[PDB]
Design a protein around this nucleic acid. Structure first.
Lengths: 205, 86, 393, 62, 82
RNA sequence: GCCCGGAUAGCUCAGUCGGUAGAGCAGGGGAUUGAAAAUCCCCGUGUCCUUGGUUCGAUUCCGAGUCCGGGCACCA
RNA sequence: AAAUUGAAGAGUUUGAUCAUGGCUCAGAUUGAACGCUGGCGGCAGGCCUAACACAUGCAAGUCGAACGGUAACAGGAAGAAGCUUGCUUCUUUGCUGACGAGUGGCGGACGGGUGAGUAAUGUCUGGGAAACUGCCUGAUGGAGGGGGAUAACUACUGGAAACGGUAGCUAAUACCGCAUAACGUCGCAAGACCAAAGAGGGGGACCUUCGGGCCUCUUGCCAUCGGAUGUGCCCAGAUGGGAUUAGCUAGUAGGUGGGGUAACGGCUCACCUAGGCGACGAUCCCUAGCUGGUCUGAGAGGAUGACCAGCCACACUGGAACUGAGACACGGUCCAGACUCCUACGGGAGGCAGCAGUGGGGAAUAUUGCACAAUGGGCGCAAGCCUGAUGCAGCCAUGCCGCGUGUAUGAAGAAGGCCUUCGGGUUGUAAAGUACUUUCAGCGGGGAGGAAGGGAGUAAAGUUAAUACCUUUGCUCAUUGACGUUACCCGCAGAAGAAGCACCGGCUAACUCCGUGCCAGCAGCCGCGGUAAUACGGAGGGUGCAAGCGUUAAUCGGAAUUACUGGGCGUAAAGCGCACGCAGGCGGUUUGUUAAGUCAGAUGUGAAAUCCCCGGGCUCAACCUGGGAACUGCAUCUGAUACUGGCAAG
């Protein structure tokens, strides 16, 4: 499941850009930044020791654009792997194709990039990929299909990635419409949107 | 279950049942001829009698008449009487 | 596992009408009995006149069209319906399902209420195709008075605009035709001559989307749920996917059998009775208030728009105007259902002998489309005849 | 068992054949159940629009 | 009597076999006393998909065992020592 | 699929089961009270089965139908 | 080829407060339902209720190269016959292919299902000694002769059916003794003594009844000694409840002999002695297949054995016996019980807890599927035959995961709703407008792999009769996919076909208003609600989840709330009213000596599957699968001797 409705709603509640709807409205008419959504958006949100956890979990799932079933899946995988679950999950979250495609300018938003990956616009290793959750391997290249190399929405997005610093585990070239996923994602540049203390609290319940 | 597509191995079991029943009492009651040589006191004549028995004692366990390795115990139980003699 | 009925020659749904004690089951036995002698070639035979336990056990008349037979032109299936005033409902629905009817009357009683009620149904709700039989003729002491007794039947026809003498009115003694009396076996089979030509012929709506208004339902032990009745439209074949709509929630099944008259059926046809076996369905859920159909051809509704004519007292209608807010009983295929009615903008009443636009609101849903006929009744009389012009939600 | 019926609108009767779930309400003595609306002879509750999946009430009605 | 046979594994349209030391009184995909190899008849680019223990079969047939026809085939394309 | 019976104020009792349904008991409101009980002072209910008919007349009769009980009735 | 990430707090006692402690609660999970809602794809899942009864279908048999026979089908061979006329009919002939039916050989007891028994030497964990087997397989011997039966078939015949009845013929790989046999059998030894089956292929020579024989090969038999998957016994430790569950046993306890057993023991019978077992649990009566492992939680602990997999018992009921390696048995046999069914009323028939299907129960459940393609199993002399076994599509939101339902951009944001300070704000760049693609579904096009083996032709080799026969391979090409337009991929518009569900007093993420005005109900607890309620119900907006959603129950958690991990008892529920003292537990200090336990050590084992760690693969995941890590203990035995334990003295 994906967000079909109005996308800029979310960013205003969550205190972040979510990297969607990165356009602008003219002369800041009814610009609706610096407010939370709706008529009661000027009222303060209220917390509990679990409430902070649910609001941080919403945050991370709106960053990387993943379902709760996807995030529960990756967190079981994080715990299958040795070491600590928290850092094991943060390594999982940063490498997935839809995010690497937004980082690599193919989509000017998260929703352009998730539509690109589903709609066979990105092929990886030269082979077509129709799922958001494919793990790009180190030193491999993501590569636009010819029928997506015509998309005006992508051609604007890849220019919006030039003179834009990219997370230091990948590079992209507008002129190729191809980006090298140079190496493994690094927690020392990007981490996920949650509290490592809270994630072990719910088993004590 | 209720059915099998053939029935003839069930009739093969009854054909066998009756030809085993008819001769399992035959091969075991001949021993009344052996017992008179046990009563005569003499180990060698007792043994010769059990050797006269051996033709029917091995075939009774080869065949379906009691099945399995049942010749061994019959030979053992009858010996355990005649081995008191010398 | 069963043997198969083969769709050879045209085929028609018919039925007996008239009162109790008059001959209402006797006549339909007796015609089929003389047919096996006369059409079929046989000699008068004891197995001709009696019938098997197994059909009697189920074809109690009031839930089952128990009678199927053959004639030189067509096959027939036939429905048996109550002759008394305690129960008339299964006649007045059965009229819209049949292509014509066999009218029985007994000289011993004379005419009774159901000989005068069931004759009207072919104008009111069904079709005007009636053939007539005058029963127990042997009882009357004078033949020349029997002839005047038959002029009563020509009047009874003429009461409800049936032609009093161009309708075929056989004289007979159906229990004497049944047993093998030489005079009365020879005075029944004229009726099957007329049945072969008065319909004149069935015509079947087997091009249209499948509509089986269910008449009755059965529980086969170990195999489950069979739903059956006259097919009003369309076709079924074995392994088709099928939808049940009507008084219940809509659900889908697979028709995994298709039968007619307790035999498997190479093809279910419109205008004839057909049964359908259903996969993964339990006898706990199903009811006769259902209608089987091809998925997405017809939907259940409680509300509908319609045109309806209100009879004049001439036609045995009202003489009082028909006001808004009435609660008439409607008649749709195998089933009757009652609804509260409404009249057009600024109409509080419509007069007897006038046509109106109506909106109905039933007390239970049935499967409905445009072009479905009804008649209305308001209790003591039928008062109108009409058609669903479109369904509403 | 005594079984609570929630929201106004009662289609159940002194012979209505029904289903009931757990309904915890120690507020009322002995009551440990809740009667499921829109199941068997029980129809769904009146004036609901925030429920559809609860009370058997379907996509909304008055 | 002991046998060296296929016992079956793997999902719909995508099967697998474990080559196994078994009795004909046993269930095919059930009881065995040893796995002597694996055979994935469909798999491509899976190096760990296939083994067969020739050394084990030579022990078993010395004890009077028989190789089933899939096994008797597979030993001629697996190396004659294992 | 059909057929039968039951529908006087919250309760009760009456009323040619053809002749404009009458009365009582209990309760509720208001006031007291922020509210309620209780009290004190005011006041109402008839689904007289819904709805069509029969008749000079329907409360009470007949069909139609709901809920609830009961009847008639089946295994391609 | 290695390894851990785990332990919690919150609402609620009162005017206010601390401690103790119950109640409620946040979390995770189920073969789950209920109720709403739903598009697409993968793999997975769907009685978890009545061991309750099943309509109808369907699930291990098979070989003519064991035998006698010749119903069917075709053919040959021969006769006869007809203008079908050298082409055509009929007949005959077991003569051939061949096969209906009978006799005969091995498995059907196998696979598959269920959880009713069994608290169990079944099962778990580990050993002990008196055991055994289909059949595969190591290896030794043997095959003399004679006699004898009968179905099929042949004829005759009753009954509704079951059931057959009457009478005749005869064959074997069918029937039987003696013979005859190995490392064989028994016997203390002398000595006696043990089996059984043939059939089939074919050539030069050679006989000849021209059948056949002989010859040789192939195929099969029987006895017997070995091996082995499989199976049994014994033994030790462990195995829910009632002690308001106190006696149980002589067929015991112990012994001895016969009997009996695969073997073993009062197994069983009997004698003789009198003992055995129990209140720290005999006995009595109740419940429950177990286990690897599945769920939950720091784990202990608890729940729990299901989806997959090892094993046990069972299959509407009761009695008994047998077929066979092995079965009072699921697919079979005699009888009884109940019900049901056929019936000529005499009589007979049947048990899905196999597969599909179904009625019923209940809160609740797939298609009388499809297929020879591939895996195993049973017969097969071999080609071959069987299989609902097996593989594989369907149905369904039953399970899990992955994907999509459009998206870049875009306002004087405009109406409306909502909220409002009445300015606007906001819903929302959401709409309008501008720009773009079709993934997926659809439709069309293309199309891998699951396939190995198997068939035949032909050559050489081996086997061998110089020779065939018999058989393998080489080589040729004969032939082989259910699932199925497959998996996977490519073309083609076009946003076109894809959003509902629950929540907003606090614990709990969401706030404002209005009405109903202590009402409707509302929460689990505290409680909310009595006319401007984030507690009701709705509105809008907000929050949370998503083709799934909420809710209910169930399990486990929080709980230390029975505390080893991890509690109190003066007084929080609380120390025996007191003494004396056995059971059992515990034992100063000193001398000597010992060690199974401990500890050091080793040997044997918990395999696979399942589990865990690390890889590999199906695009990813779900899913599949490899390698490597795990199994602390247990059984037994070796060193040390501080110590528990043992032995002796002071």
């Amino acid at each position: 499941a994906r967000y079909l409705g109005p996308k800029l709603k979310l960013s205003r509640r969550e205190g972040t850009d979510l990297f969607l709807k990165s356009g602008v409205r003219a002369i800041d008419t009814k610009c609706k930044i610096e407010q939370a959504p709706g008529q009661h958006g000027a009222r303060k949100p209220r917390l509990s020791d679990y409430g902070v956890q649910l609001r941080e979990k919403q945050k991370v799932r709106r960053i990387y654009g993943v379902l709760e079933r996807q995030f529960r899946n990756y967190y079981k995988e994080a715990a299958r792997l040795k070491g600590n679950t928290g850092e094991n999950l943060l390594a999982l979250l940063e490498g997935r194709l839809d995010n690497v495609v937004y980082r690599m300018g193919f989509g000017a938003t998260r929703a352009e990039a998730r539509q690109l990956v589903s709609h066979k616009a990105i092929m990886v290793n030269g082979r077509v990929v129709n799922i958001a959750s494919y793990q790009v391997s180190p030193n491999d290249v993501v590569s636009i299909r010819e029928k997506a190399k015509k998309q005006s929405r992508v051609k604007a997005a890849l220019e919006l990635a030039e003179q834009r610093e990219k997370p230091t585990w990948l590079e992209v070239d507008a002129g190729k419409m191809e980006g090298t996923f140079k190496r493994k994602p690094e927690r020392s540049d990007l981490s996920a949107d949650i509290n490592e203390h809270l994630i072990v609290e719910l088993y004590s319940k | 279950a209720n059915i099998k597509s053939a029935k003839k191995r069930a009739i093969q079991s009854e054909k066998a049942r009756k030809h085993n029943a008819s001769r399992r009492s035959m091969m075991r009651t001949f021993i009344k001829k052996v017992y008179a040589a046990i009563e005569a006191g003499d180990k060698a004549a007792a043994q010769k009698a059990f050797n006269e028995m051996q033709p029917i004692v091995d075939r009774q366990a080869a065949k379906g008449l009691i099945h399995k390795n049942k010749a061994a115990r019959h030979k053992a139980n009858l010996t355990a009487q005649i081995n008191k003699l010398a | 596992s069963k043997e198969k009925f083969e769709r050879t020659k045209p085929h028609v749904n018919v039925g007996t009408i008239g009162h109790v004690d008059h001959g209402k089951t006797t006549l339909t036995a007796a015609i089929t009995t003389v047919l096996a002698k006369t059409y079929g070639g046989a000699a008068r035979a004891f197995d001709q006149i009696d019938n098997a336990p197994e059909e009697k056990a189920r074809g109690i008349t009031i839930n089952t069209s128990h009678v199927e037979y053959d004639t030189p032109t067509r096959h027939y299936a036939h429905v048996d319906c109550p002759g008394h005033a305690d129960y008339v409902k299964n006649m007045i629905t059965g009229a819209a399902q049949m292509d014509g009817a066999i009218l029985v009357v007994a000289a011993t009683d004379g005419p009774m209420p159901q000989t005068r009620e069931h004759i009207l149904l072919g104008r009111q709700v069904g079709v005007p195709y009636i053939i007539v039989f005058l029963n127990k003729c042997d009882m009357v002491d004078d033949e020349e008075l029997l002839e005047l007794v038959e002029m009563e039947v020509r009047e009874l026809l003429s009461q409800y605009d049936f032609p009093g003498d161009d309708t075929p009115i056989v004289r007979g003694s159906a229990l004497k035709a049944l047993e093998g009396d030489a005079e009365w076996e020879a005075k029944i089979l004229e009726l099957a001559g007329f049945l072969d030509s008065y319909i004149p012929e069935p015509e079947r709506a087997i091009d249209k989307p499948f509509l089986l208004p269910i008449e009755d339902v059965f529980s086969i032990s170990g195999r489950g749920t069979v739903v059956t009745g006259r097919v009003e439209r369309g076709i079924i074949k074995v392994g088709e996917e099928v939808e049940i709509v009507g008084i219940k929630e809509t659900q889908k099944s697979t028709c995994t059998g298709v039968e007619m008259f307790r035999k498997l059926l190479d093809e279910g046809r419109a205008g004839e009775n057909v049964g359908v076996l259903l996969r993964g369905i339990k006898r706990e859920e199903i009811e006769r208030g259902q209608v089987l159909a091809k998925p997405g051809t017809i939907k259940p509704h409680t509300k509908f728009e319609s045109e309806v004519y209100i009879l004049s007292k001439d036609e045995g209608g009202r003489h009082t105007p028909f006001f808004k807010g009435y609660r008439p009983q409607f008649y749709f295929r195998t089933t009757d259902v009652t609804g509260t009615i409404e009249l057009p903008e600024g109409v509080e009443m419509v007069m007897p002998g006038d046509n109106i636009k109506m909106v109905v609101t039933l007390i239970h849903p049935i499967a409905m489309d445009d072009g479905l006929r009804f008649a209305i009744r308001e209790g003591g009389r039928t008062v109108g005849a009409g058609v669903v012009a479109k369904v509403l939600s | 068992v005594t079984s609570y019926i929630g929201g106004e609108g009662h289609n159940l009767q002194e012979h209505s054949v029904i289903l009931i779930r757990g309904g915890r309400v120690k507020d009322l003595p002995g009551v440990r159940y809740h009667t499921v609306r829109g199941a068997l002879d029980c129809s769904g509750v009146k004036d609901r629009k925030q429920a559809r999946s609860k009370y058997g009430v379907k996509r909304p009605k008055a | 009597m002991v046998t060296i046979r296929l016992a079956r594994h793997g999902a719909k349209k995508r099967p697998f076999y474990q080559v196994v030391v078994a009795d004909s009184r046993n269930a095919r995909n059930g009881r065995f006393i040893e796995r002597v190899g694996f055979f994935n008849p469909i798999a491509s680019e899976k190096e760990e998909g296939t083994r067969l223990d020739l050394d084990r079969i030579a022990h078993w047939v010395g004890q009077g065992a028989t190789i089933s026809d899939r096994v008797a085939a597979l030993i001629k394309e697996v190396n004659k020592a294992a």
